[PDB]
Every structure is written in C-alpha cells, then in structure tokens.
Amino acid sequence: LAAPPGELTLALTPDDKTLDPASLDRALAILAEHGILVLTGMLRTRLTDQLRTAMLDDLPEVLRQQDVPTNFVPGHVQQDPPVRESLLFPDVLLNPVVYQITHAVLGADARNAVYSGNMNLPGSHEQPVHLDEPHLWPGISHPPYCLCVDVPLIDFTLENGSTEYWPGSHVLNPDECYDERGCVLPAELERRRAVAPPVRFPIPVGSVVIRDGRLWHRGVPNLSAAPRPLLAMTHYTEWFDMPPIQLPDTVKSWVDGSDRHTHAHFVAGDVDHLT
Ligand SMILES: NC[C@H]1O[C@H](O[C@H]2[C@H](O)[C@@H](O[C@H]3O[C@H](CO)[C@@H](O)[C@H](N)[C@H]3O)[C@H](N)C[C@@H]2N)[C@H](N)[C@@H](O)[C@@H]1O
Numbered sequence: 001l002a003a004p005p006g007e008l009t010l011a012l013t014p015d016d017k018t019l020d021p022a023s024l025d026r027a028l029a030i031l032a033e034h035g036i037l038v039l040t041g042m043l044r045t046r047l048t049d050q051l052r053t054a055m056l057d058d059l060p061e062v063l064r065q066q067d068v069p070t071n072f073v074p075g076h077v078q079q080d081p082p083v084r085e086s087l088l089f090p091d092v093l094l095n096p097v098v099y100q101i102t103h104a105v106l107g108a109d110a111r112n113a114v115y116s117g118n119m120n121l122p123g124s125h126e127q128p129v130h131l132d133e134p135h136l137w138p139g140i141s142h143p144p145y146c147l148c149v150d151v152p153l154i155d156f157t158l159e160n161g162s163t164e165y166w167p168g169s170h171v172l173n174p175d176e177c178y179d180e181r182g183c184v185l186p187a188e189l190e191r192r193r194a195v196a197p198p199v200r201f202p203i204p205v206g207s208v209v210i211r212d213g214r215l216w217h218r219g220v221p222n223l224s225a226a227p228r229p230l231l232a233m234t235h236y237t238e239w240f241d242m243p244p245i246q247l248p249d250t251v252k253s254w255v256d257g258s259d260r261h262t263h264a265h266f267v268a269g270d271v272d273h274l275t
Pocket residue numbers: 071114116117118131132133134148149180181182183232233234
C-alpha cells in the first residue's frame with residue numbers, strides 16, 4: 001500500500017475541533033468493524049516537530065540505561081516523551097476530535113492513563129503478533145474498554161517500521177487464543193490470516209491512529225537509518241484500574257477540570273519521565 005486504506009481513513013485539517021454527525025458515525029463504524037481508524041491532518045508541524053526533536057534528544061539517555069526496556073524483541077525501545085510544561089500540548093493530550101470519538105465509544109467518563117512512546121530503532125527485529133490490552137475474560141465477547149491513540153512523530157513508511165495491523169481482530173477472543181504476554185497463539189493467527197489478512201501502510205506525520213486496545217498488531221523492522229518515534233496514549237473506561245500519569249502541577253490548571261479526562265497525579269517539582 002502507498003497510503004492508509006480509504007475504508008480505515010478519515011481526513012481532517014488541524015482547524016477541525018469536532019466531527020459533524022456523519023463523520024462521527026463513520027469514525028465509530030470503522031472502529032466497531034475494523035478496530036482501527038486513521039485520522040489524517042490532525043496535528044500541526046509545529047507540535048510534531050517539537051515532540052520528534054525532544055524524543056530524539058532523549059534517546060541517548062535511554063540507550064545509556066543498564067537495562068534498555070524493549071517490547072518483545074531487540075530495537076523496539078519503550079520511551080516516555082517529556083512532561084515538561086513547554087512540551088505538553090492541549091491538542092496532543094486533550095485533542096477535541098480524539099475525545100469526541102473516545103467519549104462516544106467508552107463514555108463521557110473515559111480517561112487518558114498513558115503518555116508513553118515506542119522508539120523503533122534501525123535494524124529492529126519482528127515482534128510477535130500481540131494485543132497491547134487483553135480481553136477481560138477468556139472466551140467472552142464484550143465491547144471495547146480502551147482505545148490506543150498513536151501519534152507518529154515522523155512519516156511512517158513500509159521501510160521505517162509502520163505497524164502491521166490485523167483489521168477486525170479486536171472482537172476475537174476464543175479459548176486459548178492468548179498467552180500471558182498477550183501474544184496470539186499460532187493456530188488462531190493462521191485461521192484468521194485465511195479470512196482477513198493483516199495490512200501495513202504509510203501514515204504521514206500529522207496523523208492520529210485510534211484503535212481498539214485488543215487489536216492484533218506487530219512492530220516490524222525499521223530498515224531506515226533513523227529511529228522511528230511513536231507517541232502513545234490510551235483512553236480507558238472509568239472503572240479500569242490504571243496508575244496515574246505523573247504531570248507537573250504547572251499544567252494542572254488546564255489538564256484538571258477539563259471535560260476530557262486524564263488520570264493524572266500533579267507533582268510540585270519537575271518530573272523525571274525517563275526513570
Ligand atoms: N498502546 C500503548 C502501549 O500499549 C502497551 O503497553 C501497555 C501494556 O501492554 C499493558 O499491559 C497488559 O499486557 C501485559 C503483558 O501482555 C499484562 O501483563 C498486563 N496485565 C496487561 O494490562 C499495560 N496495562 C499498560 C501499558 N501501557 C505496549 N506495551 C506499548 O508498546 C504501547 O505503547
């Protein structure tokens with residue numbers, strides 16, 4: 001593919017603060033059927049440039065750690081973006097279109113409880129197909145309780161490790177489908193591949209991906225010369241237990257008391273996001 005598939009894609013400008021009813025209906029219809037929705041033209045260059053720069057500037061500190069935290073296989077580094085006041089942007093944390101969709105899917109009490117990132121390094125390995133958040137009981141069909149909000153901080157290409165997604169996989173929860181790490185058992189993977197094979201496609205910087213937290217996906221090798229930073233948030237239902245995001249009380253004024261909710265603990269000092 002050369003672009004996000006039309007059936008998963010809704011196009012916007014950074015000026016759009018709400019989806020009209022027909023746009024919201026299509027957004028919800030895509031998330032319900034495919035478990036993944038690509039929103040193009042959401043974020044200004046000004047914001048993505050500063051976040052990209054901050055995360056690449058922090059990568060050296062991350063690679064110096066005694067144990068570099070990875071997801072599954074070499075080269076998929078867990079990296080939190082900074083929570084400096086200067087790098088906490090309302091249009092990223094409290095995006096009005098993102099929360100319009102998450103409010104409609106999860107309810108008005110839904111809250112962001114993740115402010116993290118995935119730095120995919122040059123020469124990274126293939127992750128096993130997994131879900132980031134499990135089904136709440138084995139062998140049970142239930143609606144979503146969490147939505148991953150993924151912000152690419154550079155153009156994602158097939159070369160630099162755009163994520164493999166398995167459309168419609170978010171509703172699959174037969175017995176002995178998942179292991180303790182959330183990896184899909186091989187038997188189920190092959191059966192699914194027959195009827196609905198995975199897709200991988202470019203995603204331009206400025207885009208936002210909203211997906212069911214239970215969607216099957218894998219990180220894949222970054223074959224470029226440059227690390228591929230993703231900023232990651234996750235909206236949960238009110239009743240799902242999550243630790244709070246540590247934020248500086250310098251952002252409490254606009255974060256706390258907003259009707260788009262964040263599970264946050266506000267600290268007096270600077271926060272150390274890296275450990
Ligand atoms: N899309 C955002 C992020 O999603 C995932 O991070 C998740 C964990 O996966 C999840 O853990 C779940 O899975 C574990 C192992 O399967 C189980 O032990 C655990 N009980 C179960 O809650 C935590 N609750 C929250 C964390 N933010 C990815 N790792 C990461 O790449 C990505 O940035």
